[model samples]
Target chain A: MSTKAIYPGTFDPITNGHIDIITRAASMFDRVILAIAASPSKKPMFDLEERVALATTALQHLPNVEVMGFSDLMANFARAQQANILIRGLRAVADFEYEMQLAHMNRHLMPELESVFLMPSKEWSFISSSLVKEVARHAGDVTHFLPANVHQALMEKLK
Target chain B: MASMTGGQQMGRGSMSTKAIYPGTFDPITNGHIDIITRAASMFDRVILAIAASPSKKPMFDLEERVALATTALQHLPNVEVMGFSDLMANFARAQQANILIRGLRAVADFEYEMQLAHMNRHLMPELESVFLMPSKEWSFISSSLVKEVARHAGDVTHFLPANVHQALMEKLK
Candidate 1:
């Protein structure tokens, strides 16, 4: 009966682009859970604790949003959280095919769950978390890309 | 036909005229093979250039891809397999190569391929990239679609060569 949607990501360090998506999703959904997924295929630079801390610190002002890490099927995780909607970000056509396949599989696996794709603000469409990490790691300016807290954290880590 | 022979000798002397068919060749799909075979007939030699970007991960590695290409192209004596770092640069020095061959499946392909051709021509005036319209039977084929079908262990024999079929099986494993 609720319009809760789960916004999920690795969030090694939350970026301004991600926060923009979160802000937009928060405005639309009754509640937005910023789910941190533990992907076996990926090795994050920051551990789960640090990622969660960074995400929490970056989103401190948003009371309606909550951050939690899950090590389970995304559809199952969303269902367990009582969220029927999954929010995804689309950047390009190449990404569409892969995401569409996943959405199809997820829907088939969990018939009740529906996935919604949100196009990131055009300027941030190409800005990926991996790119953010690389730029920060290489001592490039990421002030416009990340929140102040995460930006400081990145600077500290790189330094 | 004396002029034809003269032109051939001149092409061989002045600049090598090799054409490259660049594609992901997910499993040497029939449509792609068709293009390569056709393009081979038009050029001195055809290179099945596997295009890969370091930023993106592929289902198959270069060695595996070359092996698949080699096996699929065994019957075509004029076609060979090679990897390219950058297509523009690869076309620049490969004296034998002057034409880049691409296959178009649909309207969507035309829109993107046209821009690429213009850009490549501007980048290297000597290199001309041409698009070969795919046969109607295989017009609806693409690597992403093949991957989706193969993901479910579906039989893709109709779309791929025997060697590519086997390679896809191994990849799915």
Candidate 2:
């Protein structure tokens, strides 16, 4: 079946962890749209267009994935996209709890949108986009936690 | 210890010093096992230290929690499961452990982990807090959430070990 899935996140610079989840999601569904939230609240290091570009370039290898930015409520966005599944990753209980709340709220908003949770690999579990940026701010090496292109952009961004 | 899939893992673990993985482990979900299992593979000896959580009113008491952890992790020859009520640092000091295992999954975990790690370091200067990540499959599962789901008759068999799963089902009923 050709199922469309939307995976949304702030994805400041789209670290390997986000890519891992996207890659994993891509495998399960016919189409996976990587939704970069234009979250002014989070004050993401990368702007919406830049974040989308970085994620686009970094994830170009996946043919089934599309990169886009959104500001609408996820349920509305998913409904607009005709996506059958809304994907989120769970690394631990803290996130799971927040996700549980979001999942319930999103489902309440649009019961048609089924929120599904994906798990990141062990390698990506400890790596967060904010953590990578924090390490880069201190001139620590973060090449391992991000894609090569994203790493270059991160260094430049931090500089 | 070698990788189950066959390749050297990247983390720097001397394995000579004792490392302790401390938590409430209320029901010892698969997520806890995921971390300790990774620890046992890295460290010489892994201490599955269950904190006596007087604050949370855990579903399973300390003894039961320890037993379930012990049984679930029995295969790992180098791991130990036990309960403690002292301050975390004092317990680490008493155990002569220099390493503490903290698991991290999301940005939310980062703040809490840093604060806890810093405080633990303040209390015990020698204890080195190492953050470990769990595989994606088990990352979302937790003892509390599992219990909540189970109470509502949700399927949580994927999140707990067979022994813990069976015991949880029995206890809840």
Candidate 3:
């Protein structure tokens, strides 16, 4: 079946972990859309458009990958995008537990949309966008954990 | 030859350290096995203490969980499985275990484990909390997640042991 997948996240500032998941999803799904949500409540450092731009630049090499920003409810967005698959990254027990709650809620909202959990590479599994941003804010070096553009953006944003 | 009983304990270069790994372990996952195996190597004796976490409403009862953990950790001779329904501090003190083994998977775990370790220290001052990081392969899997997938008829054989998977399938069916 031709599967269209949507990976939704606040993506305050995309990290290598997000990139790894998107890259893998691009190869497996007929089409993969990186959905960056406009979560002002998260008090994100990067705006939704900036996050989408960074993700687009980072994932440009993947032919089937598309990056879009949305403020609408996930169920409505998935329906609007014609996506049948929902992609999530499995990193830790805490995240897994939270995702389980979200997956169940999303399933109730739209029964046909299947949640697919993918594990990132071991190197990127332990890092998170929030943690990276925190470290960068504290003057810790997180160069290797981010893409070139994201790294530059983070540096400029922090300064 | 001297009577090596009381004061002569100084001559004993190493003492056998016993560690207790306590958890609900509703159904032991590969991640639990990884931590227990590593604990087996470091401590002289490791007890995989399955807690009768009645509050969690575990898929497998205490006896079944202990049995499953015992089967999964059969290869490690130093590791033993037992079920307990008492407070963790009481159980550790009763077993004369000075070391408490815990697994650290992510930052979220780190925060909660810190609170638990501190509380355990308060309850049993002698019991030292030790944290072990599981391999990246099994870091993301938990018994709850595995059971959720199995209940939904998803493929979770890779996340659980052969015996556990067989039991899980039978239990679900």
Candidate 4:
């Protein structure tokens, strides 16, 4: 049986960690849908269209990974795509509880959808998108933490 | 492949990395088990150090807490259970543990853990603070929350090990 997986994130600008989890999911599932959330309420630095474009370029190597933008509830979006698995990355303890609660909520919303958590590599464990933005704002060296195109876009946006 | 052996990439040059996970563990829950399980896989030796947190006034005595953790972690061959009351830095040094493992569950925990890690480093520079995130299944639970829910007749049977759950229900009764 072919399993379709959904990874929903603001991506704002996807970091190396996001790529790590998406890559892992891409290998595990028959198809991986990278659902970029247009969370305007979060006040993300990159717009939904920009975030999707950046991720699409970075993930071009994986033939099974499809990148798109969504604005509705994650559970509704997963149902719309008929996703069998929900992929999430665990980076730090700070995000663990919120992720757990979200998984439980999504579970309640879609009983058939399974939530899977993956841990990022040690190098990216302590990093976050907001922290990366803060670093890029102050001109910290984050070349190793982001994809090449995403890093250029961040520098351009900062400039 | 990356998912299984990814995060343990750092500080893996040495196979003798002994880690100590210190906590009150009032009564060990599945959350503690999850972190210890991950730590056991990465480290050479893992000590489940039950702190005699007299100030916190734990529900279980040092002996009871130690027993529960020992039971919960018996499946891990590399893991040991011990009770300690002296400063953590001192106990870690005495045990010759180079890594101090801490579980991260929330932002509040992260802030407090940052302070503790800094202070621990200041006290014992050799003992590195290694933070591990719990599995999503147990991420929202704490020993405090488990006890509270059980005291109020909420079903926490799934949150704890069978032996620990039985001991907790007995303690509450």
Most accurate candidate by TM-score = 4
Judge candidate 1 at residue B121 and give its lDDT: 57
Interface RMSD of 1: 24.9
Candidate 2 DockQ score? Answer: 0.04
In model 1, the runs with Cα more than 4 Å from the true position are B1-173
Across residues B90-128, which tens digit of lDDT does each residue of candidate 3 receive?
Answer: 999999897788776666665566567657867986666
**Cα shift from native, residue A103, model 1 (Å):** 0.5
Error of 1 at B48 (Å): 49
lDDT tens readout by residue for model 2, B1-173: 45565431122211244778889998888888877876665456779889886686988889999999999999999999989998778888999887787776666766566667657867985666665555557767777889999999999988988999898888887
lDDT of 2 at B81: 92
Q: iRMS of every model, one decimal?
A: 24.9, 14.0, 20.7, 10.6
Off by over 4 Å in 4: A1-159, B1-12
Query: Which candidate achieves the best lDDT against the true structure?
Result: 4
Off by over 4 Å in 2: B1-173
Clashing residue pairs, candidate 3? none
lDDT of 3 at A31: 79
Model 1 per-residue lDDT tens digits across residues A1-159: 256778888887777778866765565456678898766467887778888889888876765678888889998898899887787765556765566577668867885666665555545756878898887777777788887888778788777
Task: List TM-score per model, in order.
Answer: 0.48, 0.50, 0.50, 0.54
For A37-58, candidate 2 gives per-residue lDDT tens digits of 9876858788998899999999
Docking class of 1: incorrect
A1-159: candidate 4 lDDT, tens digit per residue: 457889988898999989877875565456889999887676889999899999999998877889999989888898899886787776666576787678668767886676665656556777788889998899999999999999999999988
Report lDDT (CA) for all predictions: 0.71, 0.77, 0.79, 0.81
